[PDB]
Amino acid sequence: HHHHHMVDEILKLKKEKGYIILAHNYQIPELQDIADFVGDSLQLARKAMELSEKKILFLGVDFMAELVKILNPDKKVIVPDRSATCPMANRLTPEIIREYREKFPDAPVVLFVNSTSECKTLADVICTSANAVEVVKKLDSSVVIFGPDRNLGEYVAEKTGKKVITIPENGHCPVHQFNAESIDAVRKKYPDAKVIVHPECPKPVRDKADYVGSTGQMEKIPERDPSRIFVIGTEIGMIHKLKKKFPDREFVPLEMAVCVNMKKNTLENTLHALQTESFEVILPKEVIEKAKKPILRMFELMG
Template identity: 50%
Template sequence: MDIVERINKLKEEKNAVILAHNYQPKEIQKIADFLGDSLELCIKAKETDADIIVFCGVDFMAESAKILNSDKKVLMPEIEGVQCPMAHQLPSEVIKKYREEYPDAPLVVYVNTTAETKAMADITCTSANADRVVNSLDADTVLFGPDNNLAYYVQKRTDKKIIPIPEGGGCYVHKKFTMDDLKRVKSKYPNAKVLIHPECSPELQENADYVLSTSGMVKAVLNSEDEEFIIGTEVGLINRIELELEKLGKTKKLIPLREDAICNEMKKITLEKVERCLLEERYEIKLDKEIIERAKNAIERMLEIK
């Protein structure tokens, strides 16, 4: 048996399911039962009747799966170096400071945050629903963190006053992209449609054909008549779109805005680690009960918004 067959056998024996984020390496995407962005995986985690969830992604995603499935075993194939740096940019002391300054403003946090941060929020959001989440709130001023670029994206789509917290918060991968990158790639592929993730700078957002979450990008490419696309997000998404195109027997030209837009934390998972994870049932995500309850309210409130 090869490693993929062994993983599938273990999965069946243990009634396990593998959830993988769109930025995972190609070989991991291929063995996943469900592939998606944070919102899609949150929904899948809530719906699954598996006993074990193996989460191939970064720390906050596996935590979200645990928050929504406190009775299930949630495992990560790796625990070292899988901490999303942005998810740790809103610790409790920073939140307390802003809460004191804006006592009447609800706090919206990106799902790319730790369980502790979510537990202090009124509601969570993803890049696929951030504007809808903010528009659903009965308040004129909203605290929004930790991604300042996503806050800009939301500000453009709502009449509310958005206070981005903390200053300078954001994703190091998406901050790499510059207007020079766009000019360089666009001069080579002048007819390509430009898809930019809302974690990218305001300037890039303003110069995109579409500003979309990763799931939005997948749908845009699959449903479009266009043949060439410049992809302004982590390069792993190109594998995901190619897998979907393959299923439809189609090919399109997908050009990374930068070849080196790589999230190191997302690339720590390997097939060998997934197999070991299933065999030894480690590393298990454990969270405090009270944190789970409070964070769950913030996530479930988001999931109610259509």
């Protein structure tokens, strides 16, 4: 009854106070269901650019809320838990970027969107899981600096044939460290299922999958693949999203994988956020201006 109370009050306050709710794919299902749009980080930031509303309640982690703010600088962006963050992103530092630029000055700095806003001010181009191959393909250089995810960087090297210098050392997402034995098991249990895993997964997992793709790419695979069962190698929130879009398919987690930071957002603190209209995401004007440069370069490459 309190969830119904909270859901009803959340819906009431968002209309009353003029908020659009954007939720990342990895939010708990109860928050996905009250959001106006559910998607990946860049998808939500670009969706916000289209909106006539000027107030956004963002449900994800801090670098994503900040990406919304960078591309929507004149909108008020609030989050329910100001400590929700990406530990992988936080392991890459300005000092490491500057060190590697000095070592490899002819190598463009390609930063995965899962990166701090401060790191973005130092990057030559931003990329996402879905466009990293195309972005690195179109760059002039046969060598790039790439971070913060080593698995994604090595996947890009495989697909482009280019040299990819990854930073920091052992940059990785703990959520996507499935083991390849999980794929061996599902091949036995569901011999006709299609296995889709994220490019942030380790190479033995990527190489055993039917598809490697971002969450956005996962959402599009059943549009062209009629298989009845998909096994999904990413954070558990995506199962809810996929089942909602394709109710006549079955979606099976490769393993249970939970991002603790994504789960910091709850109905209760989401309600608190609408009641208090906090916590506002604020970036210095200078950070927004500098971080926009590699984001626009990414838009330009994607043509």
